[PDB]
Amino acid sequence: YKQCHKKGGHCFPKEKICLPPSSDFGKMDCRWRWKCCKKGSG
Amino acid sequence: YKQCHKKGGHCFPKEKICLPPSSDFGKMDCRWRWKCCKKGSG
Amino acid sequence: YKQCHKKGGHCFPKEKICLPPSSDFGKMDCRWRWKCCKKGSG
């Protein structure tokens, strides 16, 4: 997903914890029932 | 909050795990950095 | 989680700023890498 990758992120299931919450970018262009979190997050 | 409550949810921090994920209704009208999950969630 | 909620808090990720530190109740029975902060610091 181009836009998630552009933000430095990857797609994960929407309930996956991404820390800090600022690195969780929301759905972006990930699929339905996934969200985009910045690499480094957890 | 009206809309979250109307869905039968409550507000929780943005990264709180809410399972099943269909019980997570996203931000709704919770505060910034919070999200609405159906009562009984995660 | 039960003890956190009992103490009037919510569980937030470990690096969430909770001030004043007296309203940061440490882990309580929040999940690994989360902590309990009193209503008002979040």
Q: Report DSSP state, residue A16.
A: S
CATH entry 1.20.1260.10 includes domain C1-42:
no
For B14, name the nearest residue in chain A, comparing CA atoms only. Answer: A21
Task: For residue A17, give the amino acid letter.
Answer: I
B19 near A CB under 8 A = yes
Which residues in chain B are closer than 8 Å to A19, comparing Cβ atoms? Answer: 15
CA-based nearest residue to B33, from B19, B8, B10, B12: B12
Cited resolution, angstroms: 1.7
β-bridge pairing B9-13 and B34-38? antiparallel
| Cα end-to-end distance, chain B, whole Å | 20
By what method was this entry solved?
X-ray
Diameter over CA atoms, chain A? 23
Task: Work out the minimum CA distance from B17 to partner chain A, whole angstroms.
Answer: 5
Q: Which tokens go with B40? A: 């009984």
Do residues C8 and C28 make contact, with C-beta atoms less than 8 angstroms apart? no
For B40, name the nearest residue in chain C, comparing CA atoms only. Answer: C1
CA-based nearest residue to C5, from C41, C32, C42, C36: C36
Domain ranges for chain B: 1-42
Contact across the interface for C13 and B12, Cβ inside 8 Å? no
Spatial separation of the C-alpha atoms in residues C19 and C30, rounded to whole Å: 18
Which residues in chain C are closer than 8 Å to A20, comparing Cβ atoms? Answer: 13, 15
For C17, name the nearest residue in chain A, comparing CA atoms only. Answer: A20
